[PDB]
């Protein structure tokens, strides 16, 4: 604490990692952790610095989200992870424990030492006698060193008995195959030592190539030196929680800050095996402490995750970004990944929603925010239910003919409202140090309009936050309902009539002569301005301070609209031929052709309606729809032999065909299944109609005839939904639209 011996250095921090987690001499209420920073100077020079933090059981329980966690379990898991030769997949037991551990350690480090940011200039003050970083301040010593990347390509051949994978899958009916592979590798770690590996690392200064026939034997093909990528450093420390002096051995990268691996084929087991071999080799000579060996990803959960990532919490010490390939926009993808890593401190997506606030602190903030606002708003919030209708709208099937329609939108309203309401509830925060998460959220919200990566981060983060605290759902719903009520009240006076939407996005009709676009474009802008001003005033009157100012955006202007359900709607502009279709399922490459066909047919029918005719018009529309369906089915015959075109995507929360026993022999192909499973349907006999997981087999595939009749019926159901809605709305017809498939077209596939 004494400032007479602190040595201050200007530097930048490239990554923060977890090194050791130990229980102090006699302490059953808290534990100590040793965090490791890989700092860099103004010209570029790796240095290794260490800080020590103390985490109590209360913070661990708060970040965990429950009360079934103990410091003893955390210490046991951390000590087990220190030996990857026997337990290389410790976070696979309880991923939430490690997420809570990382969040707690990061928060404690941020609060005790000071404001820590990655890739930003800082002044670090360390104690010469202890060797530990004691203070961090934010300064400005010019342009900090620019981050440097290093391309990585790892390919491993791990063999696991398909019987074990089948048994594990049978244990969990909805488990993903990547998790099954990881669990099987966990059960017998010796399978990772006998695998064959190939690693290629390309930095801006050197190259590193290795080919191991067996990971336990010397490489057969070698290029470059391990002393060129990373430098091994030994440091001495005297933590206050350690009775005697200790030593730490670390890997400092040279000429790079993080690894970047494309998305062509990323396998977690290959990287895990490579890093495990590195850990075994480096931490063999006695004398120092062994760092924890933990990783996280979407494959460490039974049901997977929708976003692929790879989080390093310990060894080696630097992050690894997985970026999908074959995009011409790969560079912007990598830039966005780096920006997200720097902005959110590297916790997201690993920790999850804990990067904002601990999951056991949301109820207090939500209650405090609800206590504020206005009486009517509070009554609306308390009564909110997901099935209540706030403002009266059009009832499908409906159709608005020649009018001046207009789609409006508030881009990012839920995120802005959450940021504003968390600030309102901040008085309910137990301590003023939780403000850092809300500041991070505010930065994300501010940067979202101009940075797409921030928009994606928020779109994935807000639902997680709502899931964490079910009391946030009602708080957001009530405010959205108030916003919709104000929107309706204001629009009732600018020649507007709202016909749909939920409050963040809506559309409506205008009361204006439908022939003068020049005079019609001047009313839409006035209505937009008035609506934006009214919504802003209503939000301000409730003390809700929107950090980023509101902005209503006109998404389009049309002349015809047809609604066939509560979510599906078709807008058409009869002067420019532009149109918009919403609510049509797209779960495969064959659902895009159907969408195009539907849009073209609807364009033709609604253009025919302009000429105008009696019910004869409805008959003509029916004929056109039947013709369109016929042509679609006829064109679908030339793609009868393609299996990836007819394959449909399935989520982990639906009923799917049982996995054929031959799908577990794929090998490295099962390491890429974490959320979606593509299944095609084939007919090997009379009426078998079995299902085939397309992506679990090597190519090319040898399959029986595809079951295009079943797939075409599934698509035709959706097509007929839209066509029936259009017929019922535009011409008032009770007669549903049905297409005879089994009578006129089923022969092409039988």
């Amino acid at each position: 604490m004494d400032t007479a011996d602190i040595v201050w250095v200007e530097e930048s921090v490239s990554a923060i990692t977890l090194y050791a987690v130990w229980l102090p001499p006699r302490a059953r209420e808290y534990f100590h952790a040793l965090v490791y920073f890989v700092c860099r100077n103004a010209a570029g020079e790796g240095r290794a610095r260490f800080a020590e933090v103390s985490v109590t059981a209360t913070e661990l329980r708060d970040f965990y989200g429950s009360a079934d966690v103990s410091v003893q379990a955390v210490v046991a898991a951390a000590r087990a992870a220190t030996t990857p030769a026997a337990s290389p997949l410790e976070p696979l037991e309880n991923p939430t424990l490690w997420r809570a551990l990382y969040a707690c350690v990061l928060a404690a480090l941020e609060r005790q030492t000071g404001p820590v940011a990655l890739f930003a200039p800082l002044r670090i003050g360390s104690d010469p006698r202890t060797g530990l970083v004691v203070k961090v301040e934010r300064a400005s010593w010019g342009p900090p060193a620019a981050p440097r990347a290093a391309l990585l390509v790892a390919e491993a051949n791990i063999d696991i008995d398909p019987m074990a994978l089948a048994a594990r899958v049978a244990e969990h009916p909805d488990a993903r195959l990547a998790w099954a592979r990881l669990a099987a590798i966990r059960d017998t770690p010796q399978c990772a030592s006998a695998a064959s590996l190939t690693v290629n690392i390309t930095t801006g200064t050197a190259l590193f190539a290795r080919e191991y026939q067996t990971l336990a034997f010397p490489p057969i093909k070698k290029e470059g030196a391990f002393g060129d990528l990373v430098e091994v450093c030994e440091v001495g420390l005297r933590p206050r929680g350690h009775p005697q002096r200790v030593t730490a051995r670390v890997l400092l990268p040279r000429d790079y800050d993080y690894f970047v691996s494309a998305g062509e084929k990323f396998s977690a087991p290959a990287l895990v095996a490579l890093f495990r071999q590195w850990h075994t080799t480096v931490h063999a000579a006695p004398g120092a402490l062994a760092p924890v060996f933990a990783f996280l990803g979407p494959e460490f959960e039974v049901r997977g995750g929708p976003v692929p990532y790879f989080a390093v919490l310990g060894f080696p010490g630097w992050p690894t970004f997985t970026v999908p390939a074959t995009a011409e926009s790969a560079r912007d993808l990598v830039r966005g990944a780096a920006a997200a890593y720097a902005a959110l401190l590297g916790a997201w997506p690993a920790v999850g929603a804990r990067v904002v606030l601990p999951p056991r602190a949301w109820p207090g903030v939500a209650s405090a925010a609800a206590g504020c606002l206005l009486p009517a708003v509070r009554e609306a919030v308390a009564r909110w239910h997901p099935a209540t209708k706030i403002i009266q709208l059009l009832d499908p099937p409906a159709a608005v003919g020649p009018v001046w329609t207009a789609r409006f939108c508030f881009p990012g309203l839920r995120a802005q409202l959450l940021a504003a309401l968390a600030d309102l509830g901040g008085s309910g925060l137990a301590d003023p140090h939780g403000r850092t998460g809300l500041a991070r959220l505010d930065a994300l919200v501010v940067a979202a309009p101009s940075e797409p990566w921030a928009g994606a981060v928020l779109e994935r983060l807000v639902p997680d936050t709502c899931n964490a605290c079910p009391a946030l759902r009602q708080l957001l719903g009530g405010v959205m309902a108030a916003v919709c009520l104000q929107i309706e009240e204001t629009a009732s006076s600018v020649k507007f009539a709202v016909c749909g939407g939920d409050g963040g996005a809506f559309w409506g009709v205008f009361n204006v002569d439908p022939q003068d676009a020049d005079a019609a474009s001047g009313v839409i802008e006035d209505a937009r301005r008035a609506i934006e001003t009214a919504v802003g005033a209503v939000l301000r009157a409730n003390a809700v301070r929107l950090r980023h100012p509101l902005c209503l955006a006109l998404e389009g202007v049309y002349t015809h609209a047809v609604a066939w359900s509560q979510a599906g709607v078709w807008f058409w502009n009869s002067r420019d031929n532009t149109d918009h279709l919403g609510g049509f399922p797209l779960r495969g490459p064959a659902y895009t052709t159907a969408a195009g066909v539907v849009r073209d047919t609807l364009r033709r029918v609604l253009g025919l309606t302009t000429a105008c005719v009696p019910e004869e018009d409805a008959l003509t529309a029916r004929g056109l729809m039947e013709d369109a369906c016929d042509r679609l089915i006829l064109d679908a015959f030339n793609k009868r032999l393609d299996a990836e075109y007819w394959s449909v995507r399935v989520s982990p929360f639906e009923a799917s065909d049982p996995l054929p026993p031959t799908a577990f022999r794929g090998g490295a192909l099962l390491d890429a299944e974490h959320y979606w499973r593509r299944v095609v349907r084939v007919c090997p006999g009379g009426g078998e109609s079995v299902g085939v997981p397309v992506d679990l087999y090597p190519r090319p595939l040898v399959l029986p005839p595809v079951d295009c009749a079943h797939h075409l019926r599934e698509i035709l159901r959706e097509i007929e939904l839209v066509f029936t809605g259009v017929l019922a709305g535009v011409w008032g017809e009770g007669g549903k639209f049905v297409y005879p498939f089994d009578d006129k077209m089923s022969f092409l596939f039988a």
């Binding site: 015959f637 009868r640 595939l701």
Partner: protein, 105 residues
């Protein structure tokens, strides 16, 4: 049917143009019923690793009765017809080439 659809249908639903054409000798899979079943099993074993669904047949006197007790002759005939009627995608030889054991079929 009209256009390229007519040509595709005609090519995909009749014998190959060179099937019923005189050749110096025959290229096929001719054998008795039992040996034919054995060859079919071998070909199915060759084909399964690439997506082809397995057969899973029943048999009286087994340790699992189940259902579908058809005679071996009917089953072999249906499997042969299905294999012979399966077309080829691109330059890859059809599935019957796993039983006939010739890549030019």
């Amino acid at each position: 049917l009209d256009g390229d659809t007519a040509k595709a249908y005609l090519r995909a639903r009749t014998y190959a143009p060179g099937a019923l054409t005189p050749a110096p000798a025959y290229c096929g899979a001719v054998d008795s019923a039992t040996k034919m079943m054995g060859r079919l099993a071998d070909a199915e074993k060759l084909l399964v690793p690439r997506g082809w669904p397995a057969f899973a047949p029943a048999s009286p006197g087994e340790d699992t009765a189940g259902g579908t007790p058809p005679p071996q002759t009917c089953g072999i005939v249906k499997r042969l017809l299905r294999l012979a009627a399966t077309e080829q995608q691109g330059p890859t030889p059809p599935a019957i080439a796993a039983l006939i054991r010739n890549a030019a079929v």
